[PDB]
Design a protein around this ligand. Structure first.
Ligand SMILES: O=c1ccn([C@@H]2O[C@H](COP(=O)(O)OP(=O)(O)OP(=O)(O)O)[C@@H](O)[C@H]2O)c(=O)[nH]1
Ligand SMILES: [Mg+2]
Ligand SMILES: [Mg+2]
Length: 325
């Protein structure tokens, strides 16, 4: 039964190597974007914006927007087939230009998903996704960024979890995973919110017309107490999601302070039968409400099996210090 101090020491010891550049990539992509249309604008989001630092082994998330798209700072994103058609068409042209200017890059066009996207991979340190005509990503990324700016050190915690989620197979980037890194960020912020270590921020206050396309960098300071606070936070987090959060009644949400119940959202078993996403079906075993999308559960792919798995890994994590001992 390790103490918080031992867990902390292990974690800080595990990050020593990392504690020792996007402009060029941004310009490179902007060149192609301009080649398609000089009036289109390029915006950055993802972990680069949420943390304010770029982690080795992480991609970059880009979106293309028009003037009218930016001016409608608080509008929603449509879910119709027509919108996916326009998005697919412009992304096709852009992909064409990209392949023309870089022959060694691999450019994939992704279809049969809720959000069309172009995925670009290149040898070494070049990996990014590109979307079009959507604001929700930039918005929730800005929200998370603000939350973490309230309390910078907490970033460490989040980082750890993310890494852990990819080492255990929980992250949707691995065969068998069910929850994306975005969902884990939502969980971390929710936990921090219930413990009154942060103050609530209404999602409707974020304005896309007032954000930087490439926000500045945020320095990361190593812990000075050798990791005591970090270990305490990790253990308390695991305890909270093991014995305090009731997955049969409650919903992880940043839309409200306090508790949100499944009943008031009609996320019940009667609802599972009628629901049908992308032709598949949605689950309400591990519920994560999205702050901007309409009636979307971010844990829609968590089956009872993946639920059990999640519980088991949460239990094992407290003794191995997130697989560091
Ligand atoms: O379901 C989703 C998933 C993702 N997103 C949007 O995509 C952005 C990045 O989605 P990622 O899953 O890549 O998370 P991340 O970048 O923070 O961490 P890495 O795994 O890449 O290391 C998120 O910040 C969110 O704005 C959504 O809006 N909805
Ligand atoms: Mg990413
Ligand atoms: Mg991603």
């Amino acid at each position: 039964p390790p103490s918080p101090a031992v867990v902390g020491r292990s974690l800080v010891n595990s990050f020593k190597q990392f504690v020792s550049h996007v402009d060029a990539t941004y310009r490179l992509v902007l060149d192609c974007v301009a080649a398609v249309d000089p009036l289109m604008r390029l915006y950055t989001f993802g972990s680069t914006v949420v943390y304010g630092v770029h982690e080795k082994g992480s991609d970059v998330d880009f979106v293309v927007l028009n003037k009218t798209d930016v001016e409608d700072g608080k509008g929603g994103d449509a879910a119709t087939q027509v919108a996916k058609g326009l998005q697919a068409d412009i992304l096709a042209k852009l992909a064409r230009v990209i392949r023309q200017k870089h022959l060694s890059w691999n450019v994939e066009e992704v279809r049969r998903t809720r959000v069309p996207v172009v995925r670009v991979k290149g040898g070494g340190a070049v990996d990014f996704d590109i979307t079009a005509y959507r604001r929700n990503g930039v918005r929730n990324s800005a929200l998370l960024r603000a939350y973490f700016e309230q309390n910078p050190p907490c970033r460490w915690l989040s980082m750890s979890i993310k890494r852990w989620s990819k080492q255990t197979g929980l992250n949707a980037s691995v065969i068998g995973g069910s929850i994306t890194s975005y969902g884990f960020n939502l969980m971390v912020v929710y936990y921090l919110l219930q413990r009154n270590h942060l103050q609530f921020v209404p999602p409707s206050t974020i304005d896309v017309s007032r954000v930087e396309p490439l926000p500045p960098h945020l320095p990361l300071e190593e812990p000075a107490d050798e990791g005591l606070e970090l270990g305490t936070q990790v253990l308390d987090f695991l305890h909270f999601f093991l014995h305090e959060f009731d997955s049969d009644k409650q919903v992880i949400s940043l839309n409200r302070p306090g508790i949100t119940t499944k009943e008031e959202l009609d996320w019940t078993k009667s609802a599972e039968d009628f629901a049908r996403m992308n032709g598949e079906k949605v689950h309400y075993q591990w519920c994560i409400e999205d702050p901007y999308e309409l009636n979307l559960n971010v844990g829609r792919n968590v089956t009872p099996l993946k639920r059990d798995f999640l519980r088991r890994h949460l239990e094992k994590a407290r003794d191995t210090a997130l697989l560091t001992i």
